[PDB]
Symmetry: D2
Subunit: 44 residues, 4 copies
């Protein structure tokens, strides 16, 4: 997750949907690794 990309979307609600997911996808990179590995282990 190093390079940045622009995205265009039509529709205010579509924009808000995508922004909520952009936030979650970018924030997940900040979870400390032991917490990620645990989450992933339990999802089995």
């Amino acid at each position: 997750d190093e390079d940045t990309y622009y995205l265009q979307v039509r529709g205010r609600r579509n924009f808000e949907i995508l922004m909520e997911l952009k936030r979650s996808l970018e924030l997940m990179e900040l979870v400390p690794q032991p917490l990620v590995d645990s989450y992933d282990q339990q999802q089995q």
Copy 2:
């Protein structure tokens, strides 16, 4: 139309797939949308 920026190739690809689905949904013949939503209300 709105812009957003996202960091990371996989994140961009996911968001693009979703953008495509949200915009294509507007091209579905409306009776098929109506049927889909009715079948779902029947279930849930």
Copy 3:
């Protein structure tokens, strides 16, 4: 898009987010091919 899959999620808002996207992803299969191909052509 033939087999069906169950998904569990924690959080009412997370559930509503995912349901909105599930709907768009399933509905996009119903767009007539000439409309899909056109949309995809113009996104270049």
Copy 4:
């Protein structure tokens, strides 16, 4: 917790990636969430 059902392997995979991001977001140390949201308010 809620269930949903989705038709199609690629659709399931997308929704799973998003479910993971939404649930992992809750494990991010809150000051890092705060910083992220501040940097975004600075921009937009």
